């Protein structure tokens, strides 16, 4: 019988997967020994205690993550998004549009 816990503590065992290099300022889907997510990675100046790895905010969201291998702190921000509105006159008058 094998029993797991899948806690958020610093991981110890992992799959036989490989590792790539860090890329910044580009929308990427990071996977740091788990913890899947998409966003833009920059350099975070937030002070971390030696035992502190994960960052969190008023509504969590895990804004800060520490590198597992190189042991560097990072900041996480979601990619830009928004709605689209179309500005048009009546189709009787014309058929040109402008988007917002």
């Amino acid at each position: 019988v094998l029993s797991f816990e899948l806690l958020h503590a610093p991981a110890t065992v992992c799959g036989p997967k490989k590792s790539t290099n860090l890329v910044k300022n580009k929308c990427v889907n990071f996977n740091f020994n788990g913890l899947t997510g998409t966003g833009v990675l920059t350099e975070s100046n937030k002070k971390f205690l030696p035992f502190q790895q994960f960052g969190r905010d008023i509504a969590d969201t895990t804004d800060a993550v520490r590198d597992p291998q190189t042991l560097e702190i990072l900041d996480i921000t979601p990619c830009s998004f928004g709605g689209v509105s179309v500005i048009t006159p009546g189709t009787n008058t014309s058929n040109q549009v402008a988007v917002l």
Binding site: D57, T61, P78, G82, G83
Partner: peptide, 23 residues
């Protein structure tokens, strides 16, 4: 600079997301 009365200034001086926005 904003061209408002002293009383209006006094009144005006007394008063990261997922799908939420303000218009």
């Amino acid at each position: 600079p904003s061209k408002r009365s002293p009383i209006e200034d006094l009144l005006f001086n007394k008063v990261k997301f997922n799908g939420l926005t303000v218009l």
